[PDB]
Design a protein around this ligand. Sequence first.
Ligand SMILES: COc1ccc(C[C@@H]2NC(=O)/C=C/C[C@@H]([C@H](C)[C@H]3O[C@@H]3c3ccccc3)OC(=O)[C@H](CC(C)C)OC(=O)[C@H](C)CNC2=O)cc1Cl
Ligand SMILES: Nc1nc2c(ncn2[C@@H]2O[C@H](COP(=O)(O)OP(=O)(O)OP(=O)(O)O)[C@@H](O)[C@H]2O)c(=O)[nH]1
Ligand SMILES: Nc1nc2c(ncn2[C@@H]2O[C@H](COP(=O)(O)OP(=O)(O)O)[C@@H](O)[C@H]2O)c(=O)[nH]1
Lengths: 427, 436
Amino acid sequence: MREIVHIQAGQCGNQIGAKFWEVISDEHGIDPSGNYVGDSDLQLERISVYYNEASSHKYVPRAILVDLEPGTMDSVRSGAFGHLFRPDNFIFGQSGAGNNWAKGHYTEGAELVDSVLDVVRKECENCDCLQGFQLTHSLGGGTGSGMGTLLISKVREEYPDRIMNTFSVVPSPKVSDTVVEPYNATLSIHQLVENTDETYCIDNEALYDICFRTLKLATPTYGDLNHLVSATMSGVTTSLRFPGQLNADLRKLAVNMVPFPRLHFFMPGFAPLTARGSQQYRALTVPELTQQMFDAKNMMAACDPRHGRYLTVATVFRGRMSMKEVDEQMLAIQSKNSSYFVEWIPNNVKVAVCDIPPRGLKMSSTFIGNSTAIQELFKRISEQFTAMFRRKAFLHWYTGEGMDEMEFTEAESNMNDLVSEYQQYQD
Amino acid sequence: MRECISIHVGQAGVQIGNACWELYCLEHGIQPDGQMPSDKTIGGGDDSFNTFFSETGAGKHVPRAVFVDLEPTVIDEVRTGTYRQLFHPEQLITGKEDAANNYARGHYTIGKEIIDLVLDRIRKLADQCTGLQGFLVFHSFGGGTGSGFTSLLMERLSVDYGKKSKLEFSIYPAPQVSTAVVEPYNSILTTHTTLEHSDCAFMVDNEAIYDICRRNLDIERPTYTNLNRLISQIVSSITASLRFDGALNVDLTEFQTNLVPYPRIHFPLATYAPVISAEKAYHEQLSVAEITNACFEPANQMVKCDPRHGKYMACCLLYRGDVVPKDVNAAIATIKTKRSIQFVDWCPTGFKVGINYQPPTVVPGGDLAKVQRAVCMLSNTTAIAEAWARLDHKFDLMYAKRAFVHWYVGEGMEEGEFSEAREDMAALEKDYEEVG
Ligand SMILES: COc1ccc(C[C@@H]2NC(=O)/C=C/C[C@@H]([C@H](C)[C@H]3O[C@@H]3c3ccccc3)OC(=O)[C@H](CC(C)C)OC(=O)[C@H](C)CNC2=O)cc1Cl
Ligand SMILES: Nc1nc2c(ncn2[C@@H]2O[C@H](COP(=O)(O)OP(=O)(O)OP(=O)(O)O)[C@@H](O)[C@H]2O)c(=O)[nH]1
Ligand SMILES: Nc1nc2c(ncn2[C@@H]2O[C@H](COP(=O)(O)OP(=O)(O)O)[C@@H](O)[C@H]2O)c(=O)[nH]1
């Protein structure tokens, strides 16, 4: 039972992670009090990886929540699992998360992260075995990225023989405002690349473009985003939570998935996307499910995979259907869409099936891809930063608290390097 | 007296070990208690089956063998299974970290930090026995454990026991049940470091077994249960010679001599006719000549290859029950009539034969249909070129893009080393091409 320590920080990170944890607990059926009220014994067979044990035999999920605005538990209790997290490790800041990198990444907050690292180190050893670390946040500026990549650097320092993972969200100038973020993102990911190899780029722009246009919305609120993300990035780890064919561990997930030590930006999707409606819907069929699988609109990234090629694909079906027939349409897709995949990497279709269905849904399937497609999103975020770097806007605070211009230029150089790598490996 | 030791490395290896060992215990009249067949009940036996099992004070016939893996996922999963007391508790090792399809992980990261315990246990087991002949290896190409740990372990064995032979039961991997795309990499990385220590290897093909379990065994979704049971049956059909009686292919040295001309080339094909599915009562009957002549068909050849397009080197068989040599020789003569088979131009190539006096034993609660006739061809046909070259081709496709190289590099391999291994096996393909 290789346990996982969950790291989590930031206003958006906590918002997404609360609903994610609620979804996973509900699917596993443990009561919001913290006791097993599930409906079978296939739940607690090895699930200690996410849920530890208390003295009174009640379970206890392990996940750290930190920030720099003092009120987090005041906002963490906004759902249904406030006291559920152990009530001694809600380390809180003092100021807030203005969109200022290095205001958490160099001087203040960095003072707090030493104690944070001490606490997480103390937290880790109690388990029987360690799997690694995985982190949920957004690349959003304002203590959201600083603390994130900072703690990434120190955890990678302390445990080189484990695996990182980021559930970060790329900001976008369609849903949001306070436009200094391109700096924050394109600078933090600049060392996220060297510091981590396991990433999911849930494009907020794509989430809006699919949630407001063709999902019957008028003003997408933050809970609206939280529904879709707490669906997809909660179903992404069912393979970890549930035994099955592709039980691959973090290290093994990587070795099956990441060819090169940098080209590791997975772009996920989820075929039965659903806005918040209590009624489930009419039923869907397996070929329809696996066809909405590659729905370009369905993609949680900013591209249509038809416009590019894949490298290493996974898939996790869920429900009760034809177990052994899924290979038929897997090979059908392979045969009719050879151009979509690449010849450099044969048999890039690792597939598996999980018996359990999700909450409020019978037939569904979480998806993971790895394609050249995210070159489009990176070109977007690179132009949406370079077209404004010429005016040197707002770099006063950054240049005052400990950055410099050469750092900005070298970050742009690194990201042009990544887009070049994607381009050439597409060529 | 004589004896032998079977090693078990990897999840697949230990699953097949459980299946095979349970079948063997069933076959000899032994029971999950092993009360007594007809013998002294303490240090008894005296037939050939003693070479696998040895009686304790209770006459239990403990199988002096071990199971090894780097994660307590499957080892424990069967340690509290049917044969809990058949094997010795604290005689099944459990690793901690899975090799995770990484050959270097089993070669220089975690297996290297535990191999000492495995060596101590196997050496103690050898001290317990008195008549060791060699070793039986159950591993797989694809897995990091069953390749890296396998290679390193057998290297240690060849270092300390430099005389005895050894036989490898590996599993040639298939895309249809593939759980990695680093699988050719691990396969090459281990096999390029086997010939120097390996003596003979019986590799089984997943796609071939899958096609057997479907096209004739009436399955559509075969799990590891179906494939594993079928391969356990075929492995029993191979080793029955060592299990019972003096006949063709009794000893491991005899195995290799009857089979292996040249030390580098020691990959022999294998077949086993009865694949008749299940409780489907009777559509036809059985016949010695029928199964013998149908053996040459590419139906049941353990590994997918085209033998009729390649020159042979030897031919051995084996039969279960319903013994009468005369019609056996008549069947040999009938199939002898040179339809398209060929042989070696510089040595006699007779169809060596050794018969056994026991019909096949089928699992008491499984798919296979009870039969009483059987054949088992251990042909040393050169046509395994095709399969090896296919794997090599799948390998060198992904080397122009330097794919996945860093993952192995990070633990102590070398980038250009892979080119050396690829040239080694290109030369081995040339070696197959030499025979013409
Ligand atoms: C043309 O000039 C413009 C002027 C305004 C606008 C719109 C205007 N803003 C920006 O894009 C400016 C971004 C900078 C950023 C700088 C680069 C980071 O170090 C800052 C910092 C943070 C905390 C403490 C100390 C320093 O500051 C801020 O974080 C503050 C927020 C609060 C905390 C003052 O600023 C806003 O965002 C304001 C208050 C919210 N509103 C807006 O949407 C657009 C343009 Cl283009
Ligand atoms: N016939 C058969 N093949 C199996 C079985 N288990 C695994 N395989 C195949 O063996 C290959 C790899 O072996 P695995 O057991 O998956 O790997 P492993 O030895 O556990 O290696 P690690 O996962 O790296 O520790 C794949 O082609 C699997 O499909 C089994 O019970 N029977
Ligand atoms: N995906 C997602 N993005 C959000 C949410 N709320 C705000 N955002 C945007 O994504 C980024 C959130 O990260 P961050 O800036 O660290 O949030 P902060 O801690 O409130 O400053 C910001 O640029 C926001 O504009 C949310 O609930 N989900």
